[PDB]
Write a protein that binds this ligand. Structure first.
Ligand code: NI
Length: 341
């Protein structure tokens, strides 16, 4: 049964609620983004209207085979009427095609559902600037002050400079980047661009990337592994055993691996600056864990909320334990007392 924080009151709508069977009273199912914890339950046998971005709808049709007649893609930043209710989709600054959803209820209440997001000051000049929001359904993934990480731009600077130095020292070094979902494509695209290479990958991953409307993508990626010196592998293979096995398959073209694991936060964040990050090394293999986040840091989240000044907050992440719930509720009250709303 569907939990309350996935239901939009005063509508027939649910958000990211596909694993509960037929939800009683639901006339339209919204999907914020194409990550498995959110789409869990969708398939070619789904027969209710799904509302989403264009990029998400490309993924639903090509990867999950949802039939076209049930996919309802909406343009961003545009007022649309769904089953008698005005909605807007906004860029979530998460993975490709990820949105926040503004619902203008028939009684005058305005609700923002962030989906998954990485809050940014640029959101203060979107269509959110124009009216009051009563209720916020918030991605609380990193809602605690220990969760610090650098900007995406600092992290990409570190990756490009590290890869360019290693390969210029040793033109027979291969770069490998780990992946297990969409998101974080800048990591492997920025490294391949500094090296003058395409990114090489499996047919299944190439298919996924071809759904993402990235400009000039045919110029940047390939299934021809032999022609590429930046390879994408599943995240599970980014370890000394998996990388040794891969290097064997490359037929003596390469004699060293430099590998990247874009994690979110790890506790090595609490002590060390990005500048000071070092790899784990074994022989001719080195592995870097880089803190590339597609979720808000604590400070980014707190700024967004203190700007928006909602009347009520409903967390959508970390909701399963009483300790987590109590921690989050204490920060929400602090924020509100400090800002005065
Ligand atoms: Ni996500």
């Amino acid at each position: 049964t569907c939990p309350f924080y996935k239901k939009i009151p005063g509508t027939g709508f649910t958000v990211d609620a596909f694993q509960y069977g037929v939800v009683e009273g639901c006339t339209a199912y919204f999907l914020t983004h194409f990550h498995s914890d959110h789409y869990a339950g969708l398939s070619k046998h789904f027969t209710f209207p799904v509302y989403c971005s264009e990029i998400t709808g490309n993924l639903l049709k090509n990867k999950l085979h949802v039939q076209e007649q049930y996919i309802h893609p909406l343009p961003l930043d545009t007022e649309c009427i769904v089953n008698g209710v005005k909605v807007v989709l906004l860029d979530a600054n998460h993975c490709p095609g990820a949105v926040m959803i503004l619902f203008y209820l028939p009684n005058g209440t305005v609700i923002l559902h962030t989906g998954d997001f990485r809050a940014d000051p640029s959101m203060e000049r979107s269509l959110l600037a124009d009216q009051k929001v009563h209720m916020l359904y918030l991605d609380t993934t990193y809602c605690s002050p220990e969760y610090t990480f650098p900007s995406q731009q600092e992290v990409i600077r570190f990756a490009i400079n590290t890869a360019f130095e290693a390969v210029t020292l040793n033109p027979h070094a291969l770069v490998v980047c780990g992946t297990y979902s969409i998101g974080k494509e800048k990591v492997f695209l920025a490294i391949a661009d500094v090296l003058g290479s395409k990114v090489g990958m499996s047919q299944e991953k190439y298919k996924t990337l071809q759904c993402l409307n990235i400009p000039e993508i045919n110029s940047l990626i390939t299934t021809d592994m032999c022609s590429s010196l930046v390879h994408l592998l599943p995240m599970m293979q980014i370890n000394f055993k998996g990388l040794q096995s891969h290097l064997k398959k490359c037929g003596g073209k390469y004699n060293q691996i430099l590998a990247f694991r874009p994690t979110g936060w790890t506790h090595s964040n609490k002590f060390t600056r990005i500048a000071d990050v070092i790899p784990q090394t074994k022989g001719n293999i080195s592995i870097y864990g880089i803190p590339y986040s597609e979720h808000s840091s604590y400070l980014e989240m707190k700024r967004f909320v203190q700007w928006l000044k909602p009347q009520k907050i409903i967390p959508t992440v970390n909701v399963g334990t009483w300790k987590s719930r109590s921690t989050m509720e204490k920060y929400f009250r602090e924020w509100k007392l400090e800002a005065g709303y």
